[PDB]
Ligand binder design. Structure first.
Ligand SMILES: O=C(O)c1ccc(NCc2ccccc2)cc1
Length: 291
């Protein structure tokens, strides 16, 4: 799977909010482009002169994520975050010249991402009470991955002592994205666990945090809530469910070719961190069938 790389796999079956530190610093920002940020302004002006209803929005930037030594007490992850925007994304990661920017960043900074906006996404492996994961079909009208299968998620917008508020907004944002798109009540959702971070090599390496969330509703009840919103309540064009039993071998199915890279990242991390049992009971052959 060349279009997805794992940056981080979390220990312990996934990390809760209380175990993560963030450092939000202008040191973690994109570097100014070699010939100046005028090239970003030119792309933005061209776009607004065709679609004048578009608007910019701020985004968090992922610089790096360092895990503590496994089995240690205290905070287990440090996220190094900067600030970026939708405009900077369109002028860098989504530019036809994104590969040239990656080569220049390796040359100038020893960092293939130094000249890239790299907005941080969030996605969820969302499990039902009857042990299915939730999938969404993307519209054929969207710019990126039209018509492909996705999981719930989005790109959170800004508003350890500014740190703890930023981690809170990341965890809150994945629940809000589930409530807004799947039309579920907030009180049917568990607090998220962070599974890891995946990079989308088709979008010049921008990263998504991938979370596990459990819902107290069955697959039939989740379907009713999603559909009872009507066509204007969701950006997706359909919902469907796969048994967690069957998620284990999803990369061997015809579905795998239809999944967008950030959804591939969510499913690889679900299989490595929530699946893949380590103990004698769940690891026994009748419960973990060979092949
Ligand atoms: O060309 C566009 O307008 C365009 C719009 C979304 C898009 N993808 C989703 C997205 C990525 C990063 C930040 C926010 C959203 C790609 C391209």
């Amino acid at each position: 799977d060349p279009e997805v790389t794992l940056l981080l796999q979390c220990p312990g079956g996934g990390l809760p909010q209380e175990q993560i530190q963030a450092e939000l610093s202008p040191a973690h920002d994109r570097r100014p482009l070699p010939g100046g940020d005028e090239a970003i302004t030119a792309i933005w002006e061209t776009r607004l002169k065709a679609q004048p209803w578009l608007f910019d929005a701020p985004k968090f930037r992922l610089h790096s994520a360092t895990l503590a030594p496994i089995g240690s007490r205290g905070p287990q992850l440090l996220l190094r975050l900067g600030l970026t925007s939708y405009r900077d994304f369109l002028g860098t990661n989504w530019s036809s010249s994104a590969a040239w920017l990656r080569q220049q960043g390796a040359t100038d900074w020893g960092d293939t991402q130094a000249y890239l906006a790299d907005p941080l996404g969030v996605g969820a492996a969302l499990a039902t009470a009857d042990d299915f994961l939730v999938f969404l079909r993307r519209s054929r009208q969207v710019a990126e991955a039209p018509g492909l299968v996705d999981v719930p998620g989005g790109h959170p917008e800004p508003q350890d002592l500014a740190g703890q508020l930023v981690v809170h907004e990341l965890f809150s944002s994945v629940l809000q994205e589930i409530c807004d798109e799947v039309n579920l009540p907030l009180l049917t959702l568990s607090q998220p666990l962070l599974l890891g971070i995946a990079r989308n090599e088709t979008s010049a390496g921008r990263a998504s945090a991938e979370f596990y969330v459990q819902c107290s509703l069955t697959s039939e009840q989740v379907r009713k809530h999603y559909l009872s919103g009507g066509p204007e309540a969701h950006e997706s064009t359909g919902i469907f469910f796969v048994e967690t039993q069957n998620v284990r071998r999803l990369p061997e199915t015809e579905m795998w070719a239809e999944l967008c890279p950030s959804a591939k990242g969510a499913i690889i991390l679900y299989n490595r961190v929530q699946g893949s049992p380590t103990g004698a009971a769940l690891g026994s052959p009748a419960l973990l069938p060979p092949l």
